[PDB]
Amino acid sequence: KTHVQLSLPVLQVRDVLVRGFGDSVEEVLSEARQHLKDGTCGLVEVEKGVLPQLEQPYVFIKRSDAAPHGHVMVELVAELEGIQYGRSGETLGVLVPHVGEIPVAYRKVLLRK
C-alpha cells in the first residue's frame, strides 16, 4: 500500500531516551521509515525549546493533504542546519525512536510510504 494507518505515541521531550535516528539526512529518513513500519516510532509535538533538546538531523511529519478514518495524511521531511529535504504542509511533530517511554496521547496518521 502507498499509505499505512498508524497510531503514533506522543512523548514528552524530557522522557525521550534516544533523541534522534542518526547522523545524516538519508540515515534519519531511512531509520524513521523502518521504525514507523516496526511500530517503534514516537512523536514529539514541537514547541519553544523542544528542538534544541533533540539531535539533528530532525525528521518531521508534515500534513500532506486536507483525513481518512480520523488519520491525517502525512509525509516525512528531514532538517539539518536549517535546510529541509522535502516540501510539505504544517508540522505535526518530530519523530524519535520509541523504546518504551509512556506516551501522553496518540496521533492517528496515514503515512505516505
Swiss-Prot record:
This is Host translation inhibitor nsp1. It comes from Severe acute respiratory syndrome coronavirus 2 (2019-nCoV). Signal peptide: none annotated. The chain holds residues 11 to 125 of 7096 of the full protein. Residues 1-113 are annotated as: Disordered. It is found in: Host cytoplasm. Residues 2-113 form the CoV Nsp1 globular domain. Inhibits host translation by associating with the open head conformation of the 40S subunit. The C-terminus binds to and obstructs ribosomal mRNA entry tunnel. Thereby inhibits antiviral response triggered by innate immunity or interferons. The nsp1-40S ribosome complex further induces an endonucleolytic cleavage near the 5'UTR of host mRNAs, targeting them for degradation. This inhibits the integrated stress response (ISR) in the infected cell by preventing EIF2S1/eIF2-alpha phosphorylation upstream of stress granule formation and depletes host G3BP1. The lineage of its organism: Viruses, Riboviria, Orthornavirae, Pisuviricota, Pisoniviricetes.
